[PDB]
Design a protein around this ligand. Sequence first.
Ligand code: HEM
Ligand code: HEM
Ligand SMILES: CNCCN(C)c1cccc(CCc2cc(C)cc(N)n2)n1
Ligand SMILES: CNCCN(C)c1cccc(CCc2cc(C)cc(N)n2)n1
Ligand SMILES: C[C@H](O)[C@H](O)[C@H]1CNc2nc(N)[nH]c(=O)c2N1
Ligand SMILES: C[C@H](O)[C@H](O)[C@H]1CNc2nc(N)[nH]c(=O)c2N1
Ligand SMILES: [Zn+2]
Lengths: 411, 407
Amino acid sequence: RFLKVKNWETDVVLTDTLHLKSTLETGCTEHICMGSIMLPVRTKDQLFPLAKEFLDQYYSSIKRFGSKAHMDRLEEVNKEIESTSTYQLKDTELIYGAKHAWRNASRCVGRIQWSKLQVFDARDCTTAHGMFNYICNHVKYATNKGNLRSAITIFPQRTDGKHDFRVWNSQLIRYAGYKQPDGSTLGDPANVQFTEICIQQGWKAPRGRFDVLPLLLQANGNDPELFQIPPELVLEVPIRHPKFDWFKDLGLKWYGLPAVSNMLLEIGGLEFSACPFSGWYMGTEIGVRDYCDNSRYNILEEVAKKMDLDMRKTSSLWKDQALVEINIAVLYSFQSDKVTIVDHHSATESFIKHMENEYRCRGGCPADWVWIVPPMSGSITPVFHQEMLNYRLTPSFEYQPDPWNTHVWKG
Amino acid sequence: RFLKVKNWETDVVLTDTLHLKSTLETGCTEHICMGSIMLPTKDQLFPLAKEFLDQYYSSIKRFGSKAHMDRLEEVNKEIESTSTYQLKDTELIYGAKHAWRNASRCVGRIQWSKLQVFDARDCTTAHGMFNYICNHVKYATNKGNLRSAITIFPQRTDGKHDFRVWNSQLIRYAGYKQPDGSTLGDPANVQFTEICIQQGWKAPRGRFDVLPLLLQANGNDPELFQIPPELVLEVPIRHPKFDWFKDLGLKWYGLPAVSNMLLEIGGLEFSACPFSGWYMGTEIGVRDYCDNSRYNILEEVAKKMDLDMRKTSSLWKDQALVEINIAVLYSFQSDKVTIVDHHSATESFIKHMENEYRCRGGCPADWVWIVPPMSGSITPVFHQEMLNYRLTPSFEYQPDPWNTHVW
Ligand code: HEM
Ligand code: HEM
Ligand SMILES: CNCCN(C)c1cccc(CCc2cc(C)cc(N)n2)n1
Ligand SMILES: CNCCN(C)c1cccc(CCc2cc(C)cc(N)n2)n1
Ligand SMILES: C[C@H](O)[C@H](O)[C@H]1CNc2nc(N)[nH]c(=O)c2N1
Ligand SMILES: C[C@H](O)[C@H](O)[C@H]1CNc2nc(N)[nH]c(=O)c2N1
Ligand SMILES: [Zn+2]
């Protein structure tokens, strides 16, 4: 079968065949679309076809499909599964797997970069201290003094589900949040629950507006341990505005390295429950969501006052006006300090080119419009006008439950 | 089978059961989501009538009444005999209000029950259609105090006797292709602006010429009429701080009036059913003015503001976008013409959703369309999970008539 998508601004029509190789479900049916819903141990039985499919993919990409090397590898994996009930990926396979998980990530606007991913193999790790060391090296490599480099670190795969490696932080670098007795929040409201856990686990909180959280690291299904990331490894950027001099006195800053650490990486039926990955920020992630969401730092008002906008009627668009000036500030600050960042115009334009290229060389590009379209100025970006097909390919990144809800405590 | 939707800003969780009453298809499958795609007999007719009459009579608390069963048999006998049937006025009004209620892409549905329905099923000619349409325009415009309305022309019979309004909206600006290869007026209407000329319309070849109506009654050839200029309320666009803005020469019309959709009620098809409400500011300032395949004035405005247009990262496009939208709102408000900003309209839709959840069991909604085209995440609808599904009565798309009509 063939499926067409149309860009309603250019009238370019692309044809998708790649969706035929789709395995996983979407959540939608002929009778309902679940497109805007945020969040919609394997047996010997299920494992071999999942492995075979992946190795077929891998060997195709290297133009060795049907070769003796291909056949021998399938036989070896087969034997290993029936003897040990799991299997180990070769280095080459792991790298290919991790790059393709990113490539297949339909909510990611940054995928033009997918083939440039530094893969750190941490499968020999056994303790939380060893995890800390690997993560420290990842942060140093990825930061690169401001000249950011995409990377992923991969800890040992799941076995019986009782010896999982997990990074309990949602991101390697994130600011604490503290609920006050008066109901107000100091710091990042999104991180209150995790901050509470850290404190209970022994963290001494300085209790400021921008305290970098410690790492909470779980190895081999053991109880998690607290580690502090060396401050000299945490690159931060003070936020100022090119024309507004009072903006610096708002006291804002942010970290340079966006590094997601709570997702599950699935490759050929194997599950890697700890696989922190990092790239660089699109400006609106910070300026629109982190700073201006009502449920986060929420500075729209304070900024709006300082600009002396008419804040009486929403139709003055004072919220919209402040939002833009803030996003100008975030971009200006990072560029001035020479920390890698991309604006939403540049990012979305690059994504359209990537997607066209993918339709031509691969037969499609799974994409989630609800997430691809930026959270400000939607229709003046080329993605808004682009029809997109959403479906799931493997290898892939998946959500998993928060560890504090599932963990069996040793004490 | 019972579905929950979460608002990620307020943690309010709603439970949806209404989707179980859905009959039509979404385009999605378990293997692929098509959420961002813009486009999708006697024996067939009676269950549709029944389904419709059942919900009608349920709404008036007379489900399982003699009056219910009576109408059901009467309609059945009418179909068995005439191969169609006619709606009572009460049912017609119910169906139209519910078609709006069920429109999953419409952010303005909180007003759904306050719709003025004009029954034009006695109309037989294009001059008659014109008259009904002028009356609709004048009633809805109301000197700037806008009122929602729909006018319903005769239903489809054998597909040969179709009533159609050829225009996409009752009021729209012409579009012409100029020697340069550029475009004067509205690029969206070039093809239609030419079908008007190619039918006899003398164009002022200006930038903002109100298009003529092209009206098709009972299948016959379409005819041209100019809407009395005194019936077309327009707003000069000025900025409340930039005195140079008024010299850009922009204006827009007050009345958004969609005329190319198909209204389906109880299996019956109303191919000509123009409806109108009032604008959300972004439709004009973001889409009409700043879209690249429309009036596309961002560059000109940015210049006038003397912004650094060297690098995308100065966000000069964004800055100007906001100002253009401030001006649209300011101009309509100053000239006393009904308009709503995107903040107000989305706040209203949230309240409406919550009302619909507790009184109906849900509210079909298309997030891709409900979220405004600027400042999306600072509006409450961005953080709102929504379920999209198709209920009837409904408004549907239908083919452009100039590809189907046999002269
Ligand atoms: C290098 C520059 C990158 C940029 C500019 C970028 C941008 C984004 C943005 C804006 C989102 C939306 C998430 C949100 O708004 O909260 C996203 C999602 C995502 N990104 Fe990228 N990203 C980059 C690199 C990467 C890398 C290196 C990986 C993995 C190796 C990755 C994997 C993903 C995945 C799996 C999602 C979906 C998350 C979900 O489903 O919730 N990205 N990306
Ligand atoms: C009264 C104020 C109203 C407001 C503020 C409003 C707002 C909107 C907006 C912004 C859209 C998105 C369409 C686009 O961006 O092009 C929309 C879609 C729609 N509206 Fe409303 N509307 C109003 C009245 C009405 C009325 C009176 C009806 C019918 C009786 C209606 C039926 C629809 C339908 C069927 C769609 C979706 C059409 C499609 O699928 O393309 N609206 N509305
Ligand atoms: C529910 N989604 C938010 C947290 N998750 C799972 C997530 C996953 C991938 C990307 C993001 C946004 C943060 C981010 C990460 C990376 C690696 C790059 C970037 N520009 N931004 N977040
Ligand atoms: C791609 N579809 C856009 C044109 N169509 C069919 C359409 C249908 C309903 C509404 C609109 C937007 C114009 C409009 C109409 C009405 C009645 C109110 C309003 N604020 N805006 N457009
Ligand atoms: C490709 C995508 O479906 C298309 O650009 C849609 C996106 N969302 C929209 N939303 C509204 N309200 N109106 C539109 O015309 C569109 N266009
Ligand atoms: C309910 C809705 O799906 C949810 O708010 C989504 C909308 N789109 C998004 N898009 C991005 N990039 N990031 C997000 O967190 C969200 N949130
Ligand atoms: Zn869907």
